[PDB]
Design an enzyme around this catalytic site. Sequence first.
Site, PDB file in Angstrom:
ATOM      1  NE  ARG A  99      -2.607   3.416   2.075  1.00 40.17           N
ATOM      2  CZ  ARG A  99      -2.969   4.358   1.200  1.00 40.17           C
ATOM      3  NH1 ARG A  99      -2.360   4.522   0.025  1.00 40.17           N
ATOM      4  NH2 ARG A  99      -3.938   5.203   1.546  1.00 40.17           N
ATOM      5  CG  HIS A 107      -8.837   0.365  -3.229  1.00 37.48           C
ATOM      6  ND1 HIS A 107      -8.485  -0.944  -2.994  1.00 37.48           N
ATOM      7  CD2 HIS A 107      -9.281   0.847  -2.044  1.00 37.48           C
ATOM      8  CE1 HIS A 107      -8.581  -1.198  -1.699  1.00 37.48           C
ATOM      9  NE2 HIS A 107      -9.080  -0.132  -1.105  1.00 37.48           N
ATOM     10  CD  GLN A 119     -13.293  -2.452  -1.533  1.00 38.90           C
ATOM     11  OE1 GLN A 119     -12.644  -2.325  -0.476  1.00 38.90           O
ATOM     12  NE2 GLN A 119     -14.364  -3.223  -1.629  1.00 38.90           N
ATOM     13  CG  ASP A 123     -14.359   5.902  -1.352  1.00 42.55           C
ATOM     14  OD1 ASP A 123     -14.382   5.640  -0.122  1.00 42.55           O
ATOM     15  OD2 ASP A 123     -13.303   5.910  -2.025  1.00 42.55           O
ATOM     16  CB  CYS A 169     -14.477   0.724  -0.811  1.00 45.58           C
ATOM     17  SG  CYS A 169     -13.933   2.434  -0.486  1.00 45.58           S
ATOM     18  NE  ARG A 229     -10.066  -5.218  -0.155  1.00 48.66           N
ATOM     19  CZ  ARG A 229      -9.572  -4.205   0.552  1.00 48.66           C
ATOM     20  NH1 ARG A 229     -10.373  -3.264   1.027  1.00 48.66           N
ATOM     21  NH2 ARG A 229      -8.270  -4.133   0.779  1.00 48.66           N
TER      22      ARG A 229
END
Lengths: 308, 296, 307
Positions: free
Chosen positions: C101, C128, C131, C224, C264, C292
């Site tokens: 990340r 992402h 996700q 989001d 998410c 996930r």
Amino acid sequence: SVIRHFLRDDDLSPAEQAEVLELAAELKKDPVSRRPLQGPRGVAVIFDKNSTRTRFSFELGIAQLGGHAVVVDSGSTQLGRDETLQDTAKVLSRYVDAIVWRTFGQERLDAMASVATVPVINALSDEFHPCQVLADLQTIAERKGALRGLRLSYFGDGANNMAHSLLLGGVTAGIHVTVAAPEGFLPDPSVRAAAERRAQDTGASVTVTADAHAAAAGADVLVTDTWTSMGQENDGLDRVKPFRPFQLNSRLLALADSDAIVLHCLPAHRGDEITDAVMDGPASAVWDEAENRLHAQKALLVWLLERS
Amino acid sequence: VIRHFLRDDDLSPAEQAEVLELAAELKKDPVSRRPLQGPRGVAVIFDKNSTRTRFSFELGIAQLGGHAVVVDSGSTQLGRDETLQDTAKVLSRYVDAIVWRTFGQERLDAMASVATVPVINALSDEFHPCQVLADLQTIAERKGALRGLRLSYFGDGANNMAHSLLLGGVTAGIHVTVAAPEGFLPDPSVRAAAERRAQDTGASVTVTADAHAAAAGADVLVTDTWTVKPFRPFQLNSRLLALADSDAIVLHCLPAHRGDEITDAVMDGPASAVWDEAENRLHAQKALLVWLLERS
Amino acid sequence: VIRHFLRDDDLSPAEQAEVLELAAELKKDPVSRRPLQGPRGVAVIFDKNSTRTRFSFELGIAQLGGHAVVVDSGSTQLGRDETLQDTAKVLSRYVDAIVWRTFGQERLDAMASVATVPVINALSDEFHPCQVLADLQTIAERKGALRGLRLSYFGDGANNMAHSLLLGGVTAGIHVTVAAPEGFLPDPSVRAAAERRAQDTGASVTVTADAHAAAAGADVLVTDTWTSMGQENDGLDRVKPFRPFQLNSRLLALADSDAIVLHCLPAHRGDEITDAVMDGPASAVWDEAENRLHAQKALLVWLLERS
Ligand SMILES: FC(F)(F)c1cc(Br)c2nc[nH]c2c1
């Protein structure tokens, strides 16, 4: 099936607590013989404050049940802050089979247990330390046999987590529990009343006294703990002078039964609540007591998972 | 009867040979030894974080069947009322060995006298003995027998790599030279321990400010970060390397500051064994653990 | 060749379908695939921490038989102490895959250019992609075939979720709409990549400031948080421009009657999404979060066998 949690010692009935302690003895003998988390299945282990005992005992205990502990410092993750507690618990229940949480307020544990769909275990909180007391009871049984009818006296701050859990867990095991503490530092009234009512069912009793000498006399087990937790360092009180007469020292230990044993939830401040001579002497069971966090917590997890 | 590994000379010459043989066997068959099956626990404690120490030990312990409990620097400040003797006694009830990255040797010695399980120095201010086991494994797999070889370390001669290359080097029969400027020479009791060990193995100890003569005829050339003017003459560069024996190998416990203590041309070149060296931290530390556990 | 997953279009339409099928299979039989038995190691490295990313990767790797080495941001940050190339070369000797990340995409590209094991973008400023794999798995299990569905995302149109829904969505044949205010639009290079991929799959890209038009007839509504930590000090009022794009009960009622809602997480209830929508019968956010775990395990299995 109803989901069982373990937030306070009286969450187990007397018969249930005996099943857990028997399982703790079995798992000490055969530590990889129960694999309910084989897979591995996950268990969350969340800390709002760290603890060597809690970290090592849970992470390894979960692994020995076949599982995988995900170990989180909640200070780093800002739990409760970046989303609602309920949202967090809903997602945790999708990734793990149980939630082990060291936190401060008991209301936080209650909130997590009312929304999570997996067992929640109180690793250590401001009000209770029920996993330590399971380990204490395992240690006492190892050394003395039947718990019913023993006399245990705790000395020091009468309203901390260990005093409360020795009251509730002790009388659940049939132990006559005495708390010796100075005025102003006595057990929470609702905890004391809960312990007195549970003691009726087991033939145990609850005593609260300011007379340390009287509490030590005839005792089978003497217990103390640090006088001050981290949250209390800034509470404005002199937290030494009230407690000095309640020090677990050689003089006090000599008043108990010849075969009495000594317990102390770690860490210890040698020279305050306990002396070197007692801490390091032949009556001390503190290191077995610390080891038994591993076995007793494994037993608890096996038992909760199997009933949930 | 509990063996510890806090400095390179804690292993005798014969014992170090056993550990290095085991490292070679474990490199070939990395899950063939499962002394920690269960899993049994091993504590891996950092007073100061070290990512590459964490990778090699954490994975190595897992491949022995065990479970590493990894404690990072954030918890170094133990809470109110916590001690070291009491920590050691409690750890000894949960784990089968304690791996510790700390600063002063005094603290390592204290843990080792109290703990009833083996204690390993993952990295300290005075010594880096697990890195030197990996270095010796790297030299051996490329050159064969270590006895008689000539190794030169360049740069800061007062740091943990200089001390460990002296002690572990002479334990293996290697003729060790440290090439360092005046204010940065080996600790004198370490140097004397190394000169002593060297008599048993046919090795020797040399300390010099002359980088050219240290490199001349070297079989192994080692450096390490410097922390800066006094070290520039010791830079391990294209020019020194030309002076060594043919087929000489270059080592560097990472991280490297390219263009300070070593040049791109040396590190990326065909003498460099820096990447195999880094991998061998995994194998050599697993071997050390297997060996300590079966004697403890 | 070693395969990496740094952005959603790193998988072709056919390859993405393979990964999503594997995710359904792994959800059914979560420990039947053990490519990391040993254990083999996987690096899970956080330049900034994400707890739900940690949970899902750490358990997922364990269920593949491996051992995740988790590095939090409290360590010296990759790149400061040595080159990313040097770090990638050491990691490649210790682990069979690198999950990272980080922030800018060039750091991911650098690490993948030298690594001899697969590199996975756990979460970055631009994308992402893990996700969105979980999102697609969720949509497929709630809707069946993905091809031809209509998905609208609402909010900041230039964040990692907007970019990944565009790319991953059109790769699956989904008609994707981004509903965002002026000045918060998708990156043009990302929009052009999505438009080109959509030609291969029959999908389409729409970008609009008309929230009502984006919701009308949508099969899937997504939002989001409007602001990342990095953006809190960017000087913009990051609330006023976004309120017309709130995913609330009135917006949801415009969509198809069988529409589902994705987010998410974490959600800021009352800002980008309301309690009514997120706790109501259209919400799939909890299955989304669970997936996930399954979708990232599928990705790892797939990358490890092709590399
Ligand atoms: F379950 C999740 F998603 F993994 C999770 C766990 C924890 Br502990 C958290 N603390 C703040 N957000 C969190 C999210």
